Design a protein around this ligand. Structure first.
Ligand SMILES: [Cl-]
Ligand SMILES: [Cl-]
Ligand SMILES: [Cl-]
Length: 129
């Protein structure tokens, strides 16, 4: 599913992501924009052989099981395929664990490089929330 901008903001809020660990909704929408362009089915293969999955490009080295990332963990206790669903529940619940891991949203390199320090509220501007 490719979400609309406000549609995704609303879904993220519904699932308790808004201001989670102090990160406003615009941060999460911005991260999703640059990680996946709001496409739940986004996948990308990393140089280390791990894969990133879903709207927030969650990585199989630590967070989910895909059966093909040697030496990896599955800390969210989910198949990576769950992160591709039209229902963002699994992605949100896993993101909550990731952002609580110590480095906040810096875990998403694209958030650090493209969202951090910017006017992230622009991402939820106009949205009925
Ligand atoms: Cl915001
Ligand atoms: Cl594996
Ligand atoms: Cl980047």
């Amino acid at each position: 599913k490719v979400f609309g901008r406000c549609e995704l903001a609303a879904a993220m809020k519904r699932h308790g992501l808004d201001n989670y660990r102090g990160y406003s909704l615009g941060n999460w929408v911005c991260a999703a924009k640059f990680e996946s362009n709001f496409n739940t089915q986004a996948t990308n293969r990393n140089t280390d052989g791990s894969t990133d999955y879903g709207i927030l490009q969650i990585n199989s080295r630590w967070w989910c099981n895909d059966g093909r990332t040697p030496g990896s963990r599955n800390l969210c206790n989910i198949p990576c395929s769950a992160l591709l669903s039209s229902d963002i529940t699994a992605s949100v619940n896993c993101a909550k664990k990731i952002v609580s891991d110590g480095n906040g949203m810096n875990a998403w390199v694209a958030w650090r490089n493209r969202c951090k320090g910017t006017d992230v509220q622009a991402w939820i501007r106009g949205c009925r929330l």
